[PDB]
């Protein structure tokens, strides 16, 4: 894997890589979104490979924007801590 520090700044590489990774960024990046990623990134204290980073940041902004509409909350309670299982698909 490959670790890093939360002192990185946004640049063209962010949109360039994201666009190639499979993410089309239209509107500028928000602070809540950026801070969120850094919050879990530093809180995790783990390491992720290059490919893992592309997928993490990709699926994060991909599934994040699609959900970002009315109000991202989803308060159901009674959960055993989900590990992001059961990915999306076509379902037929």
Swiss-Prot record:
Residues 69-92 are annotated as: Disordered. Keywords: DNA replication, DNA-binding, Primosome. Involved in the restart of stalled replication forks, which reloads the DnaB replicative helicase on sites other than the origin of replication. Functions in the PriA-PriB and PriA-PriC restart pathways, but probably not in the PriC-Rep pathway. Displaces ssDNA from a PriB-ssDNA complex. Also involved in inducing stable DNA replication during SOS response. It forms, in concert with DnaC protein and other prepriming proteins DnaB, PriA, PriB and PriC a prepriming protein complex on the specific site of the template DNA recognized by PriA. The chain holds residues 89 to 179 of 179 of the full protein. GO terms for molecular function: identical protein binding; magnesium ion binding; single-stranded DNA binding. SsDNA binds at residues 37, 40-41, 46, 56, 59. There are about 50 molecules per cell. At this concentration it should exist in a 3:1 monomer:trimer state. The lineage of its organism: Bacteria, Pseudomonadati, Pseudomonadota, Gammaproteobacteria, Enterobacterales. This is Replication restart protein DnaT. The N-terminus (NT, residues 1-88) dissociates PriB from ssDNA, but a smaller region (residues 1-69) does not. The NT is also involved in trimerization. The C-terminus (CT, residues 99-154) is involved in ssDNA binding and forms a 3-helix bundle with a long flexible tail (residues 155-179). Both domains are required for cooperative ssDNA-binding. The CT is also involved in trimerization. One of its GO terms (cellular component) is DnaB-DnaC-DnaT-PriA-PriB complex.
């Amino acid at each position: 894997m490959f670790a890093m520090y939360p002192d990185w700044q946004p640049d063209a590489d962010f949109i360039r890589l994201a666009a190639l990774w499979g993410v089309a960024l239209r509107e500028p990046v928000t602070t809540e979104e950026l801070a969120s990623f850094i919050a879990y990134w530093q809180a995790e204290g783990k390491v992720f490979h290059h490919v893992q980073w592309q997928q993490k940041l990709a699926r994060s902004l991909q599934i994040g924007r699609a959900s970002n509409g009315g109000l991202p909350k989803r308060d159901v309670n009674t959960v055993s801590e989900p590990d992001s299982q059961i990915p999306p698909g076509f379902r037929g």
